[PDB]
C-alpha cells in the first residue's frame, strides 16, 4: 500500500526525439526500454452481492488490475531484428497494428493491484492516490491458471491493453514515464494514444501518516514541473476520471 503522488501530460510524436534529449540533459541518465500487459477484472454480475451495506455504504465494488511483463520477442516483427533493442524502435510504433494479437494473449492466460479515487478537496497540488498491491508468484493444481484463479475469487475478465514506452530515473525516487497504449480485442488492435505519447511523472510514499515526507515529495514534483515550463505543461488530471468503481464507467486513457 502506497500513496502515489502524480502529475500528468501528453506530447505529440513530432517533438518526441527532441524531448528525449532534453531529459538526458537534466537527469544525466539514458532512457531504458520497457513494456507491460495489464488485464482488468470486475466482479461477476451473475452473483448478487447483497453484502454491500446499502443503508451505510461501508464499501463499494471495485476493479482489479493484474499486470505482467512480456518479452520483446513477441513485439518485434520479422523486419526489426536488424535494429538494436533501444528506444529508437518507438519511432516505428505509430501504426494501430502490433505483432501481439488476441490469440497469443488468450494463450498467456503477475502483480495484483487495487486503487481508490484520489483525495477530495481543491487544496491539493498533485494527484494523491492510494494503492493496495500484492504479488502472485506461482500456483499448482488441476486448474492452475490466472483465469481460473480470478473466477475462484469471484471476478471475470473485462478488457486488456498493452503499454510500451521509456523510463527515466531521477533523484529522490522520482520516476518519469513516456507511454503508448494499445487496446487489444479479437476484432483487432487500436492505439488509443494515437499520434502522441502520454507523459506521467510520479513518486511513491510508503506510509501515508508521515507528512514531512509527503511535503518533500510535493516540493520535488512541483520543482520538476516548474523546470519544464514552456516545453510541456504538466497538470493534475480530473479527479472524476481516475475513478475505477464498477457502478460508474469511465477510463482515463
Amino acid at each position: 500500500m502506497v500513496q502515489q503522488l502524480s502529475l500528468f501530460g501528453s506530447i505529440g510524436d513530432d517533438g518526441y526525439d527532441l524531448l528525449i534529449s532534453t531529459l538526458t540533459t537534466i537527469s544525466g541518465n539514458p532512457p531504458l526500454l520497457y513494456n507491460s500487459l495489464c488485464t482488468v477484472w470486475k466482479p461477476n454480475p451473475s452473483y448478487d452481492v447483497e453484502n454491500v451495506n446499502s443503508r451505510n455504504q461501508l464499501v463499494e465494488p471495485n476493479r482489479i488490475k493484474l499486470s505482467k511483463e512480456v518479452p520483446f520477442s513477441y513485439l518485434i516483427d520479422e523486419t526489426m531484428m536488424d535494429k538494436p533493442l533501444n528506444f529508437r524502435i518507438l519511432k516505428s510504433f505509430t501504426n494501430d497494428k502490433i505483432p501481439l494479437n488476441y490469440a497469443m494473449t488468450r494463450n498467456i492466460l503477475w502483480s495484483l493491484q487495487i486503487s481508490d479515487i484520489p483525495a477530495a478537496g481543491n487544496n491539493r497540488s498533485v494527484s494523491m492516490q492510494t494503492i493496495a498491491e500484492t504479488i502472485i508468484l506461482s500456483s499448482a493444481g488441476k486448474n492452475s491458471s490466472v483465469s481460473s484463479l480470478m473466477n475462484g475469487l469471484g471476478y471475470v475478465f473485462e478488457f486488456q491493453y498493452l503499454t510500451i514506452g521509456v523510463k527515466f530515473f531521477m533523484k529522490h525516487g522520482l520516476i518519469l514515464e513516456l507511454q503508448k497504449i494499445w487496446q487489444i480485442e479479437e476484432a483487432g488492435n487500436s492505439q488509443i494514444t494515437s499520434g502522441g505519447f502520454l507523459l506521467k511523472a510520479y513518486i511513491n510514499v510508503s506510509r501515508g501518516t508521515d507528512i514531512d515526507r509527503i511535503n518533500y515529495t510535493e516540493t520535488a514534483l512541483m520543482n520538476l514541473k516548474k523546470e519544464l515550463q514552456g516545453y510541456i505543461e504538466l497538470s493534475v488530471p480530473d479527479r472524476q476520471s481516475m475513478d475505477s468503481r464498477v457502478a460508474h464507467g469511465n477510463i482515463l486513457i
Binding site: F169, M170, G173, L174, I175
Partner: protein, 89 residues
C-alpha cells in the same frame, strides 16, 4: 638503471586504476537499476582494490608452503604418488 620489479610496480598501478574504474561502473549500474536505493558504498563489500592482489599473493605463498609440506611428508615418504593440479570456477 632498470630494476627487476619496475614492471611489477607499473602493473600494480595499472590494475589499481582498472579496479577503480570497475568500482565506478558498478556504482553507475546500481544507480541506473533502481532509484530508491541510496548509493552509500560499504567498505566491507563495495571497496575491493587491495583485496584481490593481496589474496593472489598470499594464496600463491600458501600454495608453495603446502606444496613443500606435501613433498616433505608424502612425496619423500611414499614413492609413486601422483599429483594433479586443477582450478574450479
Amino acid at each position: 638503471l632498470p630494476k627487476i620489479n619496475d614492471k611489477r610496480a607499473n602493473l600494480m598501478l595499472v590494475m589499481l586504476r582498472l579496479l577503480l574504474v570497475v568500482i565506478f561502473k558498478k556504482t553507475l549500474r546500481s544507480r541506473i537499476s533502481s532509484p530508491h536505493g541510496l548509493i552509500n558504498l560499504n567498505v566491507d563489500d563495495d571497496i575491493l582494490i587491495i583485496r584481490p592482489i593481496l589474496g593472489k599473493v598470499r594464496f600463491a605463498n600458501y600454495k608453495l608452503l603446502l606444496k613443500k609440506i606435501i613433498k616433505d611428508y608424502v612425496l619423500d615418504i611414499v614413492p609413486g604418488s601422483s599429483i594433479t593440479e586443477t582450478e574450479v570456477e
